């Protein structure tokens, strides 16, 4: 409704004239803005006739009630607003170019917090894991051979694997002159490997919001 | 309050500029503050828009004052009626918002892992340890097995009695590997949470979706009857904003800043030359966004005033060759005043754990001593 | 419009010109826009991730079974 | 407190300073030799502390990952009136800042800041073909008209910031339409331009003709750990 | 060691490929450059638009 | 083609059409046939195929 002292409708509005078989109202919105621009371009004078006999349109025992009813007959030659296009309405009336799209769409709540998959614990490529295993076996064989040159049989493999994981695992350390250097060099590789693995997971844990993608009804 | 011409004393940028102008052209000035605090706008009264010139603009136009030295913005409406000298300061509308303190999160240390995950690892340790004891006793103790499994997961050196059987050894190694995976996953998850845990982004200009879609939770306004009001009314794209600001439009440039500090407001849109000073002087506010109505100030004068030519020259010559830096760096620029750090959200959970263990330890020792008594 | 109304052509071209320059772009943004229109938010994945937990435990169970199998093989002799 | 508790528990059922030594080792990397106090309940205390060490270390490493995410910082001069420019021979002088000589910017600075112009003339008769923008790797600051400096900054491959804004510009002036003295066109043009500022003008026109690839940006940079 | 891992995590997290165009409002399109070659089909509705 | 990805948002939202000469008497029949058959039970059949 217009303000008691407003009188005429304020800017960005048009005089709504709700009519039936009196009060002044202001009608504004999307389609009204379209109507104003059409009048300015085409160059006619409009007169809103806000309907009250029904809804956007329906057929009752051969009678059209609503905006289509008014457009039908000769009561008002336009029905600007929210009017869908279908065969029945387009058969008795003459629509225009669709300025807004519509349809029977589906609304689905987005799945907040996508969870990392089961295989999210492997930032390393399959060749990355295989190469690490082969190097561990080669290093273990080198350590045992060096120790034999100057006991330990399976301890080297046990010790070699412990360093790559958390060091908190009991293990006998093979004493020697150069075998220790090999252990340290492997130990540095374990530290560098573990740091890289933990760093990657931090990048993998950063997920997004995933919404189920239906096929469209 | 007398409310009738109480003699005060003024000083500052504009007054300093006025004194310089008077000296260089022989004025004799008598400053006089506007009767009603208001910059000036065209109001409609009795179907006569031009009849109502509210604020200091009306005072100059009516005849009370023949010069309007003040931070008066230059725009079309005023330029049509009064004469504006060359700008003495270039500015533009900008948004001032309260600085958001970077608080932390993760009130508990166990947040990264769900309650089920903690239980799964808890029973996993027990099941793994018991199976190791059975394998060791098979010959292809429980206390030793429990100590070893617990120590490996917690990364402690209390481990003793390493498994001897090959089947036990392989199971233990895989158990240790699982321990590394769990701890590494926890740290990676925490790093992702901490990195992605930052305060809400600031407005960052008039193009922000928050401003373009006004909501009751956001209260941004300006000063009533100013150039900001005129700028928004003229535009048609900024249709939603004006209706929102018209609701909470304030009464002065000082009240609005106080509201922002008190949290009653959320975003003030005003001249950048003034907001940038308040942010610098007051260490609580930060101006965001980019200037979107770049204009200047001006010593407005009546259309027939003969001072226009020798004020405009005086501004260009004196003010903006050796003077602007002197004045600006003295009254505007001279006055001068990081990711969150875990403080007591992580420690509270961890500390309660340590204290909780100590009370349990005191109970365990009493129980242990009682058992040893018999 | 009314069936056969002459206004069909002038209005048809008028609307088609609006789609060219503004129309939905300008008007729909003013009247049919929301706070999070596009929205793209990164979420710190909680490590509940029973798929993630299941994978790690699945390997643990397989290793546990392998240890039992090797123990039986050694115990065979 | 934990160390005192462990020693007291051990005394109830040797170790004097070992508990403090062992307690500190767990909080850091466990790879440090230490004697483990054997006991019935003291071990439980060690494990509970060990869990606190694991939780603490994980939190500490996690935070550094958040701290290492830095940004691009541009030196914020005071706007041609900073102590760096005037009287440069007070602290470590900035890399020689020059400009195009035999112009208007040089004349203004010489007439207003003779001391700065004395040192500022190290390398800058006429021209220099404004190549200092491309050679802004051996000299720090460049002084010249702000209207073009903004354009070259925006249009440049990559981009470099300009220590200027609403303020921080020495002799801020504008671009005009030089009409004849007393011409009647002054008023109609004056109002016409003032209306352009209201709706489009710079906004529409400056974006078309005076815009670059990185007009604005704030790029997060993975801080290299050189960081002396 | 902790500093190294944190630095690596920051590098890995911030190390992602260049963002895609994401509409006609992207600065890359609004500021054409010789390094970007975007075109359409000759004599179509795109040319008229 | 699993090598290309479409980015951005539609910015010239329009439709296709079976254009005909201005005096063609098929316009009413064809327009009804599109609305009735194509876009009630047929569009999904054709588009999904
Ligand atoms: C300011 O305007 C006054 C006139 O209002 C100028 O006064 C003239 O100055 C010139 C040069 O000194 C004389 O030849 C004229 O006879 C003066 N006329 C009057 C009426 O005094 C004055 O020069 C101008 N000054 C500035 C700063 O522009
Ligand atoms: C296709 O067009 C034909 C004519 O061009 C339509 O035939 C008319 O149908 C109505 C109702 O069935 C009759 O009253 C007319 O006499 C028919 N015209 C002629 C010339 O016979 C037909 O209805 C149209 N069909 C569709 C689906 O649009
Ligand atoms: O085209 C116009 O007539 C109306 C038709 N409306 C149908 C609503 C069917 P429900 O109420 O949602 O079951 C949608 C809006 N436009
Ligand atoms: C300006 O000049 C007049 C004439 O000499 C002089 O009387 C006046 O004192 C000067 N300046 C002022 C207004 O003080």
Give the closest of B152, B181, B188 to A205, CB-based: B188
Q: Which atom of ligand 4 is found nearest the CA of B27?
A: 13
- Dist CA D223 CA A118 (whole Å): 32
Give the closest of B159, B196, B239 to A170, CB-based: B159
- Dist CA B140 CA B242 (whole Å): 85
Distances (CA, A) of D195 to B79, B80, B235, D177: 10, 11, 11, 15
Distances (CA, A) of B311 to B90, B299, B315: 17, 8, 6
In total, chain A counts a number of residues equal to 217
Query: Is the separation of the CB atoms in D76 and D164 below 8 Å?
Result: no
Measured in degrees and rounded to the nearest 5, phi and psi for residue B67 equal -150, 145
DSSP D172-212: -------PPTT-TTHHHHHHHHHHHHHHSTIIIIIHHHS--
Paired tokens of B14: 């504009």
Residue pointed to by tokens 């009247």: C31
Residues in E closer than 8 angstroms to D29, CB to CB, are 1
Rounded to a whole number of angstroms, the distance from the CA of E3 to the nearest CA of chain A is 10
- Residue E3 CA to ligand 3 centre (angstroms): 61
Query: How many Cβ atoms from other residues are within 10 Å of residue B26's Cβ?
Result: 6
- Dist CA A210 CA B39 (whole Å): 52
Measured in degrees and rounded to the nearest 5, phi and psi for residue B296 equal -135, 175
Residues in C closer than 8 angstroms to A206, CB to CB, are 42, 44-45
- Dist CA B184 CA A198 (whole Å): 5
Q: Which atom of ligand 3 is found nearest the CA of A56?
A: 3
Residues in C closer than 8 angstroms to B209, CB to CB, are 35-37
Task: Look at C35 and B192 and tell me if their CB atoms are within 8 Å.
Answer: no
* Degrees, nearest 5: CA angle D67-D70-D72: 165
Measured in degrees and rounded to the nearest 5, phi and psi for residue B220 equal -115, 130
CB hemisphere CA count around B235 (13 angstroms): 20
CA dihedral defined by B203, B205, B209, B214, rounded to 10 degrees? Answer: 80
Measured in degrees and rounded to the nearest 5, phi and psi for residue F4 equal -115, 150
Structural gaps in chain F: residues followed by a C–N separation over 2.5 Å: none
Rounded to a whole number of angstroms, the distance from the CA of B180 to the nearest CA of chain A is 6
- Dist CA D170 CA D78 (whole Å): 10
D1 is in an annotated binding site: no
Residue of A207, E1, D54 lying closest to B346 (CA atoms): D54
Residue of B117, B178, B188 lying closest to B152 (CA atoms): B178
Q: Is B194 in the pocket of ligand 1 (CB under 6 A)?
A: no
D82 is in an annotated binding site: no
Residue pointed to by tokens 């700028």: B231
Residues in E closer than 8 angstroms to A206, CB to CB, are 13
- Dist CA B92 CA B228 (whole Å): 10
Query: Is the separation of the CB atoms in B120 and C56 below 8 Å?
Result: no
B317 three-state secondary structure: helix
Residue of D142, D79, D88, D115 lying closest to B334 (CA atoms): D79
Paired tokens of F16: 């296709």
Task: Look at E21 and F11 and tell me if their CB atoms are within 8 Å.
Answer: no
- Dist CA C28 CA F10 (whole Å): 14
B288 three-state secondary structure: strand
- Dist CA A150 CA A147 (whole Å): 5
Query: How many Cβ atoms from other residues are within 10 Å of residue A15's Cβ?
Result: 14
- Dist CA B103 CA D137 (whole Å): 39
The bridge status of strand B267-271 relative to strand B220-221 is parallel
Paired tokens of B176: 């240790």
For chain A, strand residue ranges (E) read 14-16, 25-27, 58-60, 63-65, 206-208
Residue of E1, B242, D110, A30 lying closest to C24 (CA atoms): A30
- With residue B244 as reference, give the H or E element that holds it: helix B239-248
A60 bridge partner residues? A63
* Degrees, nearest 5: CA angle B178-A134-C69: 50
Burial B185-201 (b: 16+ CB within 10 A, else e): bbbbbbbbbbbbbeeee
Residue pointed to by tokens 């004194």: B19
D61 three-state secondary structure: helix
Q: Which atom of ligand 2 is found nearest the CA of F30?
A: 28
Query: Residue D36: which residues within 8 A CB-CB, separation 6 or more?
Result: B157, B158, D22, D46
Cβ burial of A60 (10 Å; 0-12, 13-18, 19+) is exposed
CB hemisphere CA count around D131 (13 angstroms): 5
Pocket test for ligand 3, best of A54, A68, A84, A95 (most atoms within 8 A of CB): A84
Measured in degrees and rounded to the nearest 5, phi and psi for residue B271 equal -60, 135
Query: Is the separation of the CB atoms in E12 and E4 below 8 Å?
Result: no
- Dist CA B192 CA B198 (whole Å): 11
- Mutation target vs A (from B49, B148, B159, B184; most A CBs, 10 A cutoff): B184
- Dist CA E6 CA B188 (whole Å): 10
Query: Residue B143: which residues within 8 A CB-CB, separation 6 or more?
Result: none
Query: How many Cβ atoms from other residues are within 10 Å of residue B15's Cβ?
Result: 16
Rounded to a whole number of angstroms, the distance from the CA of D75 to the nearest CA of chain B is 17
Residues in F closer than 8 angstroms to E45, CB to CB, are 12, 14
B95 three-state secondary structure: strand
Q: What is the resolution of this structure in A?
A: 3.6
- Dist CA D50 CA D30 (whole Å): 10
- Taking CB atoms within 8 Å and a gap of at least 24, the contacts of B249-254 are B249/B221, B249/B222, B249/B223, B249/B224, B250/B221, B250/B222, B250/B223, B250/B224, B251/B37, B251/B223, B251/B224, B252/B37, B252/B223, B253/B223
Question: In terms of DSSP H, where are the helices of B63-165?
Answer: 76-81, 115-138, 142-154
Query: Residue C46: which residues within 8 A CB-CB, separation 6 or more?
Result: A113, A115, B112, B114, B189
- Residue B32 CA to ligand 4 centre (angstroms): 22
Query: Residue A75: which residues within 8 A CB-CB, separation 6 or more?
Result: A69
- Dist CA E42 CA A183 (whole Å): 68
The bridge status of strand B285-288 relative to strand B93-98 is antiparallel
- Residue D86 CA to ligand 3 centre (angstroms): 73
In total, chain E counts a number of residues equal to 49
- Dist CA D16 CA D37 (whole Å): 10
Chain F CA closest to residue C16: F14
Q: What is the DSSP letter of B112?
A: T
Task: Look at C41 and A30 and tell me if their CB atoms are within 8 Å.
Answer: no
Task: Look at F11 and C19 and tell me if their CB atoms are within 8 Å.
Answer: no
Query: Residue A152: which residues within 8 A CB-CB, separation 6 or more?
Result: A143, A144, A172, A174
Query: Is the separation of the CB atoms in D225 and E4 below 8 Å?
Result: yes
| Minimum CA distance residue for ligand 4 atom 8 | B26
Query: How many Cβ atoms from other residues are within 10 Å of residue A158's Cβ?
Result: 20
B270 three-state secondary structure: strand
Task: Look at D41 and B150 and tell me if their CB atoms are within 8 Å.
Answer: no
- Dist CA A29 CA A48 (whole Å): 13
- Dist CA B85 CA B299 (whole Å): 6
A209 three-state secondary structure: coil
D221 bridge partner residues? D70
Solved by what technique? cryo-EM
Per residue, what are the HEC states of F2-49? CCCCCCCCCCCCCCCCCCCCCCCCCHHHHHHHHHHHHHHHHHHHHHCC
Paired tokens of B365: 């020792």
Distances (CA, A) of B253 to B226, B230, B276, B289: 10, 16, 13, 19
Paired tokens of C76: 């065979």
């Amino acid at each position: 409704p217009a303000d008691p002292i407003s009188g005429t409708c304020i800017r960005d509005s048009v005089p709504c004239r709700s009519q039936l078989n009196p009060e002044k109202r202001c009608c504004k919105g999307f389609c009204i803005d379209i109507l104003k621009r059409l009048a300015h371009t085409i160059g006619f004078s409009y007169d809103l006739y806000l309907v009250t006999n029904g809804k956007h349109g329906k057929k009752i025992d051969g009678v059209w009630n609503g905006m289509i009813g008014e457009v039908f007959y000769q009561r008002a030659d336009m029905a600007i607003g929210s009017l869908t296009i279908n065969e029945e309405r387009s058969e008795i009336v003459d629509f225009s170019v669709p300025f807004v799209e519509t349809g029977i769409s589906v609304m689905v709540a987005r799945s907040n917090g996508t969870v990392s998959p089961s295989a999210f614990l492997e930032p390393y490529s399959p060749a990355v894991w295989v190469m690490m295993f082969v190097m561990c076996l080669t290093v273990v064989a080198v350590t045992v051979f060096i120790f034999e040159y100057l006991f330990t049989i399976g301890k080297s493999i046990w010790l070699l694997w412990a360093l790559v994981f958390n060091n908190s695992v009991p293990v006998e350390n093979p004493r020697g002159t150069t075998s220790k250097i090999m252990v340290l060099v492997w130990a540095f590789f374990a530290v560098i490997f573990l740091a890289s693995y933990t760093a990657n997971l931090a990048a993998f844990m950063i997920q997004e919001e995933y919404v189920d993608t239906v096929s469209g009804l | 309050s007398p409310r009738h011409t109480v003699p005060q004393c003024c000083y500052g940028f504009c007054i300093d500029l006025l004194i310089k102008l008077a000296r260089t052209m022989n004025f004799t000035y008598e400053v006089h503050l506007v009767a009603d605090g208001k910059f000036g706008t065209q109001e409609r009264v009795n179907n006569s828009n031009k009849k109502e010139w509210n604020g200091m603009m009306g005072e100059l136009l009516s005849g009370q004052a023949d010069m309007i030295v003040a931070p008066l913005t230059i725009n079309n409406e005023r330029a049509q009626y009064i004469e504006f000298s060359k700008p003495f300061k270039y500015q533009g509308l900008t948004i001032l918002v309260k600085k958001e303190i970077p608080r932390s999160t993760l009130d508990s240390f166990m947040q990264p892992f769900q309650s089920t995950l903690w239980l799964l690892v808890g029973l996993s340790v027990h099941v793994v340890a018991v199976m190791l004891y059975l394998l060791d006793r098979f010959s292809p103790t429980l206390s030793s097995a429990m100590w070893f499994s617990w120590g490996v997961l917690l990364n402690s050196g209390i481990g003793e009695g390493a498994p001897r059987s090959f089947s036990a050894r392989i199971l233990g190694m895989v158990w240790a590997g699982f321990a590394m995976i769990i701890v590494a996953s926890y740290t990676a998850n925490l790093a992702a949470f901490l990195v992605l845990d930052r305060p809400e982004e600031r407005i960052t200009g008039i193009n922000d979706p928050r401003l373009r879609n006004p909501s009751d939770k956001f209260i941004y306004a300006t000063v009533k009857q100013s150039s900001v009001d005129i700028y928004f009314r003229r535009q048609v794209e900024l249709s939603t904003m004006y209706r929102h600001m018209e609701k909470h439009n304030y009464e002065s440039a000082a009240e609005a800043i106080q509201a922002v500090r008190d949290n009653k407001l959320h975003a003030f849109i005003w001249d950048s030359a003034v907001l940038e000073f308040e942010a610098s002087q007051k260490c609580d506010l930060v101006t965001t966004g980019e200037l979107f109505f770049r204009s200047g100030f001006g010593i407005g004068m009546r259309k027939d005033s003969p001072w226009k030519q020798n004020v405009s020259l005086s501004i260009l010559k004196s003010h903006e060759n050796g003077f602007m830096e002197d004045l600006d760096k003295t009254w505007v620029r001279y006055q001068e005043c990081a990711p969150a750090t875990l403080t007591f959200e992580n420690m509270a959970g961890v500390f309660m754990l340590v204290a909780g263990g100590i009370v349990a330890g005191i109970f365990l020792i009493f129980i242990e001593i009682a058992y040893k008594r018999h | 419009l009314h069936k056969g109304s002459r206004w069909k052509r002038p209005i048809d071209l008028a609307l088609l010109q609006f789609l060219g320059d503004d129309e939905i772009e300008m008007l729909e943004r003013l009247w049919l826009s929301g706070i999070c229109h596009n929205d793209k938010i990164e979420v710190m994945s909680s490590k509940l991730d029973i798929d993630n937990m299941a994978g790690v435990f699945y390997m643990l169970l397989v290793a546990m079974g392998l240890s039992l199998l090797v123990f039986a093989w050694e115990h065979l002799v | 407190t934990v160390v005192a508790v462990t020693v007291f528990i051990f005394e109830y059922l040797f170790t004097i300073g070992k508990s403090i030594w062992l307690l500190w080792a767990l909080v850091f990397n466990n790879s440090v030799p230490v004697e483990n106090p054997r006991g019935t309940t003291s071990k439980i205390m060690v494990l509970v502390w060990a869990f606190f060490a694991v939780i603490f270390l994980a939190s500490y490493t996690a935070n550094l990952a958040a701290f290492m995410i830095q940004e691009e910082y541009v030196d914020t001069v005071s706007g041609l009136s900073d102590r760096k420019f005037q009287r440069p021979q007070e602290q470590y002088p900035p890399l020689k800042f020059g400009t195009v000589p035999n112009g208007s910017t040089e004349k203004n600075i010489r007439s207003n800041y003779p001391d700065m112009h004395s040192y500022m003339v190290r390398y800058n008769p006429r021209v220099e073909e404004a190549l200092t923008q491309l050679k802004a790797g051996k000299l720090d600051a460049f002084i010249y008209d702000a209207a073009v400096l903004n354009y070259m900054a925006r249009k440049d491959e990559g981009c470099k910031l300009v220590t200027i804004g609403s303020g921080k510009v020495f002799a801020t002036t504008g671009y005009g339409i030089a009409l004849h003295k007393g011409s009647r066109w002054k008023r109609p043009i004056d109002l016409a331009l003032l209306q352009f500022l209201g709706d489009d003008e710079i906004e529409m026109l400056e974006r078309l003709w005076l815009s670059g690839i990185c007009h604005n940006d704030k790029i997060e940079v993975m801080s290299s750990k050189l960081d002396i």
